[PDB]
Design a protein around this ligand. Structure first.
Ligand SMILES: C[C@@H](O)[C@H](N)C(=O)O
Length: 340
């Protein structure tokens, strides 16, 4: 494992070392604006298998192909609707992933055996450079062991994968902190498959209201066209309890619960915006933008400690909050206490 630290002035020879790894069929973990990704060359069927092996990822849970040029979209997908071309122009580079029908060129291991492919153009210099210099499209899910919280720093990637993968590009902590929004363009209206770093209200204001996949609300699925729909995700070792409702009524139940669980002989962690004394505490922030940026960090911090149970302070679904609440709920296994 070579760990390459690149700072905002990108020493291109550094990226080239990782480029080489990609062309050679090896694994390279890289930052995006969203979360750290675990890359292989998307055109190399065998390289992509290593992604699945390394993570312990079920073969039918697809990967998202990352691109740096609009030209490459035409290469990876067939029958692209003009409305997908339009969203692409408008939101790329950025935290939006489009599901489209796939071309012959795309190996089925990438798509989890399907005719659809998921594509995105990341808003991160490093990731773009890595793809440009790599001269390959890069298949990548989140750079974490399957089931576990997503990585928002090279540290997180290293705690899961140092000595197991060829390369980690350290670009620091990711700016948004939650995964890209995934929308299915194989039907109209588009279907929200995974809420994410591009809020639903940005899409709807442009194209009107879209359909929400039941998966987003907890429906278990047999076939997934996108990541983050099938199997369990984002989850620390601990049990997680999400406490939803008005600020002060929530904070009071978290006090009740801290105590009730200590009385029970358990170490409690709390993640939220309020003050609390408990075995472990992580301050997520006051804005939802700050909370999304710290979510996974906080879940990893808790996961590196004794805590038997974590108590999370919910947020409203506005903006990034739909993504944050999607992640918290799935992590908890829909273990939800609605004060209200
Ligand atoms: C790694 C990053 O690209 C992730 N798969 C996402 O879509 O957000």
């Amino acid at each position: 494992t070579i760990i390459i630290n690149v700072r905002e002035r990108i020493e291109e020879w550094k990226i080239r070392i990782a480029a080489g790894f990609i062309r050679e069929g090896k694994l390279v973990a890289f930052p995006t604006e969203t979360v750290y990704g675990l890359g292989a060359n998307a055109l190399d069927e065998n390289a992509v298998k290593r992604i699945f092996e390394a993570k312990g990822r079920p073969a039918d849970n697809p990967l998202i192909i990352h691109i740096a040029s609009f030209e490459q979209l035409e290469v990876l997908a067939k029958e692209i609707p003009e409305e997908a071309e339009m969203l692409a122009k408008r939101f790329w580079p950025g935290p939006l992933t489009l599901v489209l029908p796939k071309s012959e060129v795309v190996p089925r291991v990438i798509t989890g055996g399907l005719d659809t492919v998921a594509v995105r153009m990341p808003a991160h210099e490093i990731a773009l450079k890595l793809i440009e210099l790599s001269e390959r499209p890069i298949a990548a899910p989140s750079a974490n062991i399957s089931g576990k919280p997503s990585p928002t720093s090279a540290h997180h990637v290293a705690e899961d994968f140092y000595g197991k993968i060829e390369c980690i590009i350290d670009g620091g902590e990711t700016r948004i902190g939650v995964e890209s929004t995934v929308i299915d363009l194989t039907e109209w209206p588009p279907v929200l498959l995974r809420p994410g770093g591009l809020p639903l209200e940005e899409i709807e204001k442009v194209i009107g209201e879209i359909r929400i996949h039941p998966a987003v609300y907890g429906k278990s699925v047999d076939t997934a066209k996108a990541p983050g729909m099938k199997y369990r995700h984002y989850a620390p070792s601990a049990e997680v309890i999400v406490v939803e409702g008005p600020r002060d009524k929530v904070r009071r139940k978290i006090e009740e619960l801290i105590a009730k669980f200590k009385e029970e002989g358990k170490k409690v962690g709390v993640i939220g915006s309020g003050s609390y004394d408990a075995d472990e505490v992580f301050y997520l922030g006051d804005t939802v933008e700050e909370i999304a940026r710290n979510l996974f960090k906080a879940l990893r911090h808790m996961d590196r400690t004794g805590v038997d149970v974590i108590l999370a302070e919910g947020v409203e679904e506005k903006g990034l909050g739909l993504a944050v609440m999607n992640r918290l709920r799935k992590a908890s296994g829909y273990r939800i206490i609605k004060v209200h």
